[PDB]
Every structure is written in structure tokens, then in C-alpha cells.
Design a protein around this ligand. Structure first.
Ligand SMILES: Nc1ncnc2c1ncn2[C@@H]1O[C@H](COP(=O)(O)OP(=O)(O)OP(=O)(O)O)[C@@H](O)[C@H]1O
Ligand SMILES: [Ca+2]
Ligand SMILES: [Mg+2]
Ligand SMILES: [Mn+2]
Ligand code: NA
Ligand code: NA
Ligand code: NA
Length: 473
């Protein structure tokens, strides 16, 4: 139960991780290689098309009523589960990779055909567009009126380019994640505003012979443009085939009921990999995002030259931030989303959350994360590893949060959801690489000392562990 950060303990673990990544192997991803269970010391340069599908009406499900109650969460989870199952079936059918499903954003990757084939990149983009429209068509049909579950309102972003594949740091280190421009830029297009449709970067537009746009985020593909991609890609999978299979899956092996229990403290003991709808976890707690600021551009700068230092930097920083969350502060790392850490923190008893204490300890955790980040940069640089212009943006908020695994057996994905999850990320995104921000709900529940620290702006700079300790004395 002790929650404390220590410079010596952090330095020792950072130094050990630096030693582990002394030798790095960078491989160019070609046919017959595998992106599963990538070792710590290895990374793959992947030329691929990234699609991000944003289910825009998630936030509406979370806000059906003023109070964020149990029924709100059960219906939100069933909505995400139904729609995820449909998309995952589509991706399986077209032999694309499901990278992750983070909140309402579903990331997929198209790597085939390979560049040995003439016009491969054009064909990858065409396949991604055709698959995107299949997602849109299907997700109009995968609600359930009887359960008050709406159809999904979909906005899609697509980019093409190079990324660096490393293991995703969770669940036995099996599945990869993909660092660099294309997943990031695809996600930005997908989340830019609330207009439905399929939005390509200028890279992706150029690859399929379309004129570049001064504002790609406002230039949806037309029906005619999409049809050209469909006719070229020849998916030979129809929306009706997907829906019939999706319905059969749910009939034979239904979702069943969502049922919630609290996590026995400490939160680090949550066994996410084992959760199911009937065994979901839920309680008021703090959602925290710690984003390595500037990391995407750093990868882009190094995608071809000095790529090995990227791998060293990523593993040293992410492993240490995870250790601070889990071992120093007894919290739970949910996932990494690209380079960013998604975490949970809680204080209280087996029966109730201590809101004020949870927010104070999250403030201390935020300081500890920054102290460990700063120390990791120092130690990396002292060993001659280039770390560019990296920073750490942190946001956190308080509210009821449910954790489960969505999907059919063999095709599941973890989900942590709540208004405070969504809002903690928005607070994080408002921060520079030296800033830490708090949500309004957390602020309102906080001690006077925490309120004074964050002030009117609900944000502060250079909040390291020493500063947090002194502010909360
Ligand atoms: N490598 C990645 N893989 C998957 N999703 C990503 C990746 N990088 C960013 N994202 C997502 O892309 C969107 C934009 O991320 P963000 O706001 O952090 O961009 P940024 O601040 O420009 O990047 P950085 O923090 O690396 O400087 C978010 O939805 C985020 O979750
Ligand atoms: Ca980042
Ligand atoms: Mg302030
Ligand atoms: Mn960022
Ligand atoms: Na593919
Ligand atoms: Na501890
Ligand atoms: Na904690």
C-alpha cells in the first residue's frame, strides 16, 4: 500500500533497462516475417496504410443522463462490444491487422500487397478505403433497438507511410504497436470534427491519384472516389455477409449481462486479461494519461537514420513510467496507445473510493512520472543515446470507470471507459511537454492544496515529485 517515489530506485531500474537495450536490431518488414512477440531489442520498419475508425457517438452514450450510472455504463459497453465485434470480423475477413481499440478509436493496419508488387502502396490505400466503407455500411446495422443500442456514427482517417513496430507492452508482449507518423496522422483526421465520412491525408490522396487538399480534414472522399477504390480492391465481402455472421455469432454465444464489482485494493492487482462482461470491474477512480510529447516527430526524424536510439528511448521511458504507476503507486497500466501511457489510480477501501485522497495521490503520481521521465532523459543522454526534444504531457480526471474485455472469444480487446477517461485525455492534450492538467471533476473533489497547485487554469508546469510533495505538505 505504500505510495512513494525514490530517485535511487528509479535510477537503478532506468540503468538496468538501458543495459537491456545496448544492442538493437532493426529489420525491414517483408513477406514471411512476423510482427508477433517482437523482442525488446528488435524493431521492424513497416510500410503500411493505417486506418483509424472513430465511433463518434461514444460520448453520447456516456452522456445519456446527467448521472454517469451503472446502466449508462452497461449500455455503453454493449454498444462498444457490438460494434467492435463487427469491425474485427471485417478486418479478419480482409486479412488486415487490428492494432487496438482505444476508447472509441479503432486502429487497423494494411501491409499487403508488399512493395515487391508494382503499385503496392496504391493498392494498400485502395484496400483500406474499401474496408473503411464496408465498416461504415455494416455499423449502420449493428445496433440493437430492443436493447436501446444505437448504430455507430463513423468517421475514418487514413494515412500511408513508415512506422516502427515494437511489442505493445501488455498481455504477454505478443501484439505489436506502430510508432511514427501514419497512425498518429490517421487518428487526427478521424477525430478532427464530427462530420461523418472517409478522410485521407495528402500522402494517401496522392497514392490513389487524387488532388491534394489544403484542408484534408474537411475533404471527405466522394461516393465516386470510394467506388473507384472498391472496384480496384475487389474485397469480395459484402455488408450483408458481415451482418449475418455477426448476428449468428451473437445468437450462439451472446454477450450476456455486464456485471460489475470493485477491484480489491491495490488496483495494480486488477487482472485485466481475465475480465469478461460478466466479470467487469467498476469504481470511481482516476484516469491518467502520460504522453511522450514530441515522440511521433522524433520517430519520423529517425525512421531511416539512427533508428536504433528510438527503440532504446521508447523501452527505457515506457518501462520506467509503467513501473512508477504500478510499483511505486500501486496503480494499473491499462495499455500503451502508441507512445502514450493510459493508467488508473485509486484510493479508498474495498467498499468505497476516497475521492479527495485519490486525487491527491494521483497528483503525487503525476509528479513521480515527471521525475522519472526527467531522470530517464538524463541517463539516456549520459549513455550517448539521442532523445531529441521529448517532453511529457500528463492529464488526469476522476469519475466512475468500467474495465472489461469486449468481443467474441479469440477476438477480444480490453476496454476502460468513462467520462473521466475521455476527459483525462483532453486535459493531457491541452498540455505542453512540461505541463500537467487536472479535470474539473477531480479538481472539485480535491483538497485545497491540490486546488491551489492547479489554480484557475487547472494546469501547472514543472510539477515533479519534489514540487508535488512540497505543494501537498
Ligand atoms: N503511434 C501511434 N499509434 C496509434 N495511435 C496513435 C499513435 N500516436 C498517436 N496516436 C493517436 O493519434 C492521435 C494524436 O495523438 P497526439 O495528440 O499525441 O499527437 P501529437 O501530440 O502530435 O504526438 P506526440 O505526443 O507524439 O508529439 C491520438 O488519437 C492518439 O491516441
Ligand atoms: Ca506522444
Ligand atoms: Mg494553474
Ligand atoms: Mn501528444
Ligand atoms: Na494487410
Ligand atoms: Na509503493
Ligand atoms: Na495509486
Amino acid at each position: 500500500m505504500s505510495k512513494s517515489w525514490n530517485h535511487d530506485r528509479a535510477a537503478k531500474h532506468i540503468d538496468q533497462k538501458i543495459a537491456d537495450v545496448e544492442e538493437i536490431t532493426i529489420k525491414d518488414y517483408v513477406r514471411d516475417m512476423s510482427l508477433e512477440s517482437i523482442p525488446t531489442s528488435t524493431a521492424y520498419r513497416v510500410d503500411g496504410v493505417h486506418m483509424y475508425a472513430d465511433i463518434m457517438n461514444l460520448e453520447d452514450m456516456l452522456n445519456i443522463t446527467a448521472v454517469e450510472g451503472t446502466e449508462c455504463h452497461k449500455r455503453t459497453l454493449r454498444f462498444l462490444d457490438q460494434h467492435y465485434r463487427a469491425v474485427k470480423r471485417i478486418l479478419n475477413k480482409v486479412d488486415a491487422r487490428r492494432v487496438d481499440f482505444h476508447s472509441q478509436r479503432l486502429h487497423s493496419l494494411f501491409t499487403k500487397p508488399y512493395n515487391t508488387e508494382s503499385g503496392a502502396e496504391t493498392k494498400r490505400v485502395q484496400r483500406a478505403v474499401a474496408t473503411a466503407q464496408l465498416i461504415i455500411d455494416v455499423l449502420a446495422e449493428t445496433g440493437d433497438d430492443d436493447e436501446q443500442i444505437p448504430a455507430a456514427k463513423v468517421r475514418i482517417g487514413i494515412d500511408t507511410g513508415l512506422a516502427l513496430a515494437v511489442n505493445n507492452g501488455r498481455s504477454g508482449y505478443r501484439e505489436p504497436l506502430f510508432l511514427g507518423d501514419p497512425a498518429n496522422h490517421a487518428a487526427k483526421l478521424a477525430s478532427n470534427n464530427k462530420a461523418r465520412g472517409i478522410y485521407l491525408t495528402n500522402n494517401a490522396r496522392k497514392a490513389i491519384g487524387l488532388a491534394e487538399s489544403d484542408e484534408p480534414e474537411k475533404s471527405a472522399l466522394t461516393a465516386i472516389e470510394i467506388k473507384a477504390c472498391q472496384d480496384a480492391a475487389k474485397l469480395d465481402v459484402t455488408s450483408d455477409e458481415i451482418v449475418e455472421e455477426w448476428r449468428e455469432d451473437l445468437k450462439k454465444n451472446p454477450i450476456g449481462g455486464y456485471q460489475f464489482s470493485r477491484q480489491t485494493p491495490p488496483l495494480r492487482d486488477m487482472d485485466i486479461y481475465s475480465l469478461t462482461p460478466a466479470n467487469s470491474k467498476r469504481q470511481e477512480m482516476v484516469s491518467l494519461y502520460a504522453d511522450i510529447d514530441g515522440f511521433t516527430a522524433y520517430v519520423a526524424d529517425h525512421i531511416n537514420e539512427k533508428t536504433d536510439d528510438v527503440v532504446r528511448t521508447l523501452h527505457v521511458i515506457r518501462s520506467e513510467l509503467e513501473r512508477v504507476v504500478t510499483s511505486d503507486f500501486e496503480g494499473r497500466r491499462v495499455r500503451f496507445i502508441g507512445d502514450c501511457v493510459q493508467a488508473l489510480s485509486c484510493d479508498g477501501t474495498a467498499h468505497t473510493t476516497d475521492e479527495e485522497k485519490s486525487v491527491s495521490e494521483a497528483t503525487r503520481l503525476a509528479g513521480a512520472l515527471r521525475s522519472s521521465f526527467n531522470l530517464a532523459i538524463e541517463r539516456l543522454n549520459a549513455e550517448g543515446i539521442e532523445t531529441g526534444d521529448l517532453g511529457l504531457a500528463i492529464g488526469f480526471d476522476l469519475g466512475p470507470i468500467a474495465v472489461t474485455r469486449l468481443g467474441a472469444k479469440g477476438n477480444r480487446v480490453r476496454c476502460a471507459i468513462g467520462r473521466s477517461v475521455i476527459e483525462s485525455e483532453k486535459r493531457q492534450c491541452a498540455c505542453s511537454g512540461v505541463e500537467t492538467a487536472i479535470g474539473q471533476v477531480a479538481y472539485d473533489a480535491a483538497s485545497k492544496a491540490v486546488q491551489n497547485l492547479f489554480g484557475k487554469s487547472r494546469k501547472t508546469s514543472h510539477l515533479d515529485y519534489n514540487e508535488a510533495t512540497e505543494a501537498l505538505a
